[PDB]
Amino acid sequence: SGFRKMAFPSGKVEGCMVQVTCGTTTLNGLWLDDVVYCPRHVICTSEDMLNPNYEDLLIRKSNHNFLVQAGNVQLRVIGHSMQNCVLKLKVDTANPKTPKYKFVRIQPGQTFSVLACYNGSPSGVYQCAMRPNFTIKGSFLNGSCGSVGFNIDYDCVSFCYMHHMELPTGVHAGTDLEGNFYGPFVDRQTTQAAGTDTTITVNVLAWLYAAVINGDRWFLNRFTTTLNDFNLVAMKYNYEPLTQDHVDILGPLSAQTGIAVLDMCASLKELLQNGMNGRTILGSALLEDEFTPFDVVRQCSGVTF
Amino acid sequence: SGFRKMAFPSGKVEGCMVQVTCGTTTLNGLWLDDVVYCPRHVICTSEDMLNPNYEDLLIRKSNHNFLVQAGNVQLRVIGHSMQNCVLKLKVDTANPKTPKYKFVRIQPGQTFSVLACYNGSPSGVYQCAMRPNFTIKGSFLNGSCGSVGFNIDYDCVSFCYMHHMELPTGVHAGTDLEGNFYGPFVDRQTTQAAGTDTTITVNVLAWLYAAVINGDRWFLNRFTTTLNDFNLVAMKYNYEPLTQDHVDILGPLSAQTGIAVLDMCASLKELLQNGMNGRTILGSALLEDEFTPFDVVRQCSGVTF
Ligand SMILES: *[C@@](O)(c1nc2ccccc2s1)[C@H](C[C@@H]1CCNC1=O)NC(=O)[C@H](CC(C)C)NC(=O)c1cc2c(OC)cccc2[nH]1
Ligand SMILES: *[C@@](O)(c1nc2ccccc2s1)[C@H](C[C@@H]1CCNC1=O)NC(=O)[C@H](CC(C)C)NC(=O)c1cc2c(OC)cccc2[nH]1
Numbered sequence: 001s002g003f004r005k006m007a008f009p010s011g012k013v014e015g016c017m018v019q020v021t022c023g024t025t026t027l028n029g030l031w032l033d034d035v036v037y038c039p040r041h042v043i044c045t046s047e048d049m050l051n052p053n054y055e056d057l058l059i060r061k062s063n064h065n066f067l068v069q070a071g072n073v074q075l076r077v078i079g080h081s082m083q084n085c086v087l088k089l090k091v092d093t094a095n096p097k098t099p100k101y102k103f104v105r106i107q108p109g110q111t112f113s114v115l116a117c118y119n120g121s122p123s124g125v126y127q128c129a130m131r132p133n134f135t136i137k138g139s140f141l142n143g144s145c146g147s148v149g150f151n152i153d154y155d156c157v158s159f160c161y162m163h164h165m166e167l168p169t170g171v172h173a174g175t176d177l178e179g180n181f182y183g184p185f186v187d188r189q190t191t192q193a194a195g196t197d198t199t200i201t202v203n204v205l206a207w208l209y210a211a212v213i214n215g216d217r218w219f220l221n222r223f224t225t226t227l228n229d230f231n232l233v234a235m236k237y238n239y240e241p242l243t244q245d246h247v248d249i250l251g252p253l254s255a256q257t258g259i260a261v262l263d264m265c266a267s268l269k270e271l272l273q274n275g276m277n278g279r280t281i282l283g284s285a286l287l288e289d290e291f292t293p294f295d296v297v298r299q300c301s302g303v304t305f
Numbered sequence: 306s307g308f309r310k311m312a313f314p315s316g317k318v319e320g321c322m323v324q325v326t327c328g329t330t331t332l333n334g335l336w337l338d339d340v341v342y343c344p345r346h347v348i349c350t351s352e353d354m355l356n357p358n359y360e361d362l363l364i365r366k367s368n369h370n371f372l373v374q375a376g377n378v379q380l381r382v383i384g385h386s387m388q389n390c391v392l393k394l395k396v397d398t399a400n401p402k403t404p405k406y407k408f409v410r411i412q413p414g415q416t417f418s419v420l421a422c423y424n425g426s427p428s429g430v431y432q433c434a435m436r437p438n439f440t441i442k443g444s445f446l447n448g449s450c451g452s453v454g455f456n457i458d459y460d461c462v463s464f465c466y467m468h469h470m471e472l473p474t475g476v477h478a479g480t481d482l483e484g485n486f487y488g489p490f491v492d493r494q495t496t497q498a499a500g501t502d503t504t505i506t507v508n509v510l511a512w513l514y515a516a517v518i519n520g521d522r523w524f525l526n527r528f529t530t531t532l533n534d535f536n537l538v539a540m541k542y543n544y545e546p547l548t549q550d551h552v553d554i555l556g557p558l559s560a561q562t563g564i565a566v567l568d569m570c571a572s573l574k575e576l577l578q579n580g581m582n583g584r585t586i587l588g589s590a591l592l593e594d595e596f597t598p599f600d601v602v603r604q605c606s607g608v609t610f
Contacts, residue, residue: 001444001445001446001471001475002442002443002444002445002471002475002476002477003444004431004442004443004444005310005431006421006428006429006430006431006444007312007429007430007431008429008430009315009316009319009420009427009428009429009430010314010315010316010430011314011315011316011317011319011320011427012316014314014316015316115314116311117609118607118609119609121609121610122314122316122609122610123311123314123604123607123608123609123610124311124312124313124314124604125311125312125313125314125315125430126309126310126311126312137307137309137588138307138309139306139307139308139309139311139604140306140307141306141605141606141607142607143607144607166306166307170306170307170519170520171307172307214475215475275583278580280591283442283591284589284590284591285589285590285591286585286588286589286590299429299444300446301446302423302428302446302447302448302449303428304422304423304424304426304427304428305426305427305428
C-alpha cells in the first residue's frame with residue numbers, strides 16, 4: 001500500500017536521447033531508427049526568433065549544418081525535413097537501442113512521464129497530466145527543449161509530448177511527435193496566454209478511490225447525488241463537467257470498492273463545499289487530479305514493464 | 306522554471322534487476338558484477354516466517370535451490386552467503402549492464418529514488434525521503450521486496466535502500482545494501498511500530514527557497530528570528546530542531562536569493578502559527594519536506610547524468 005506520484009521507468013527513452021546543434025543553439029533530440037526528431041527552432045538564431053520564417057530557414061540549411069551527437073559520438077546527417085513544428089534528421093545509423101514505439105496524441109486529463117534532459121543527457125523523470133487548457137505543469141529550464149513525454153505498455157513506448165516552451169504563468173507547452181502543438185500555441189519567441197485551467201474531475205474521483213483502497217476513508221459521507229446536481233457544483237468550483245463516459249470509466253474502481261460512483265461524487269461535493277478542515281487525503285491537503293483511473297488501478301495492482 | 310518531485314533516470318538500475326526464487330517465494334534481486342543481492346527471507350516459507358532461524362535455513366540451502374532469472378535467462382548460482390538481512394548469490398556471469406556503483410548508508414532527511422519492481426520487472430520510479438523515524442512513505446505491494454533506492458552522481462549509482470516490509474501505518478522499512486535496517490526494525494512476519502515522525506525542517510526551508518526562485522513569494526514576511534526562538538516553535542509543531550549545520554547548508558540558497566536563513570526561518574514560523582489560509586506554495590497546500598537543499602539546487606540549475 002501507499003500512494004505515490006509514480007513515473008514510468010525511463011531506461012528505454014534514455015537510450016534515445018541525443019544532442020542536436022545548429023549554429024550556437026543546442027537542444028535535445030529523439031533518435032528512433034535512423035531518424036532524429038527535435039524542435040524545428042533549433043534552426044533559429046537570436047534574430048529569427050520573434051517571427052521566424054521556418055520554410056525560408058530550412059531551405060537554406062544543409063545536412064552538414066546539423067551536428068548530432070549521441071554521447072561522445074557524432075552521427076552523420078544524410079537528409080532533413082520539417083513536419084509542423086518538428087525537424088526530422090535522417091542519419092546513416094539506426095539507433096541500436098530503439099525500443100518498440102509509437103507516436104500518440106493524448107487527450108486533456110491523460111497522464112505521462114517526462115524525461116527532462118539537458119545537452120542530450122537525462123536530468124530526471126516525473127509524471128505530468130495534460131491540463132484541460134493544454135499546458136503541463138512541468139519543471140523545465142533553458143536547454144530542456146526536445147525533452148519528451150511518454151507512456152509505456154509492457155515493452156512499447158508511446159511518445160506523446162515534445163517540449164517547446166514556457167508560458168508567462170510558469171507552465172509549459174509543446175507538441176506531439178508529429179510536431180502539432182497541444183493547445184493554440186505557436187513556436188515563436190513571443191508572449192502567449194494559457195486559458196483558465198480547470199480541475200480534472202474524473203481524476204479527482206479516481207484518486208478518492210485510491211484513498212479508500214489505501215484505508216483513508218474519513219471523507220465518505222452519507223449522501224448520493226445525480227450527475228446533473230454534481231455538475232452544478234463542479235461548474236462553481238472550476239471543475240470539468242462530469243460526463244457519462246467518466247462515470248463509466250470509474251466503473252471498475254467502483255465495483256472493486258463497493259462504493260457507487262454517484263456516492264463518491266456526493267462525497268466530492270461535500271469536500272468542495274466544506275473544504276478539508278485541515279485534514280489530509282493520501283498525504284495531500286489539496287484534491288489531486290493528476291492520476292487517471294488507469295493510473296490508480298496500475299499502481300494499486302502492481303503492473304510492470 | 307516550475308518545481309516537481311523528480312526522480313533520477315532509472316535506466317542504469319533497470320539493467321540490474323532480476324528475480325530470485327526459493328521454493329514458492331519470488332522476490333527481486335540486484336545483479337551487480339557476479340553477485341545478486343536480495344532480502345534473506347526469500348529462504349523462508351510460511352512456517353518459518355514469524356520467527357525464522359536464518360542461520361539454520363541458510364546452512365541447509367544449496368546453490369541449486371536458488372532460481373535466478375534475468376529476463377528469460379537463468380543464471381547459474383555458484384555460491385551463497387548471508388550479510389545481516391541480505392543474501393548474496395555468486396553467479397557464474399558478471400552482469401554486462403553493471404554501472405559504476407557504490408553502497409551508501411544515508412541519513413534521515415536525505416532523499417533517493419525508488420524503482421518499484423515485481424517479478425524482477427520495473428513498475429515505476431518515484432522520489433522518497435528517509436524519514437526521521439527511519440521509515441519511507443513508499444508505494445509497495447506484495448512482491449516488491451528487493452526493490453532498491455538509489456541516487457545518481459554523473460555516471461555513478463549509489464545504492465542506499467533495499468525494500469523489506471510494510472509497517473501497520475502503511476509506511477515502509479528496509480535495509481542498506483549491507484543488509485542493516487534503517488531504524489530498529491527486524492525482518493520477521495510480525496507487527497512492529499514506527500516511532501512518531503517529525504517534519505524535516507531543513508528540507509522545508511530548502512523548498513521555501515525553491516518557491517522564491519520560482520516566483521512564489523507571498524509568504525516572505527517582515528521579521529527575523531534566532532535559531533533558539535525558532536526551535537521553540539519547531540518543538541511545538543513536531544519539526545526537527547534546526548541545527549547550526551542546517552543553517553550552514555542553506556547558505557548557498559540564501560546567497561543566491563539574498564534572503565538570510567534566519568529571515569526564512571521567521572517566515573516559516575509565521576506559516577506554522579498562522580497556517581496557509583487556503584493559499585498554496587509551489588502548488589502544495591502543505592509544507593513539503595522531501596526536497597533537500599542539494600535537490601533544490603540540482604533541479605533549479607539543471608544537473609544531468
Ligand atoms: C527550449 O529549451 C529552447 N530553447 C531555445 C533557444 C534558442 C532557440 C530555440 C530554443 S528551444 C526553451 C525551453 C524553455 C526555457 C525556460 N523553460 C522552458 O521550458 N524554449 C524556449 O526558450 C522557447 C523558444 C521559442 C522559439 C519557442 N521560448 C519560450 O519558452 C518563451 C518565449 C517567451 C516570450 O517571448 C518574448 C515571452 C514570455 C514567455 C516566453 N517563453
Ligand atoms: C516483500 O515483497 C516480501 N514478501 C515476502 C513473501 C514471503 C516471504 C518473504 C517475503 S519478503 C513484502 C513487501 C510488503 C507486502 C505489502 N507491502 C510491502 O511492502 N514484505 C513482507 O511481506 C514482509 C516479510 C517479512 C518476512 C520481512 N512482511 C511485512 O511487510 C509485514 C508483516 C507484518 C505483520 O506480520 C504479522 C503484521 C503487520 C504488518 C506487517 N508487515
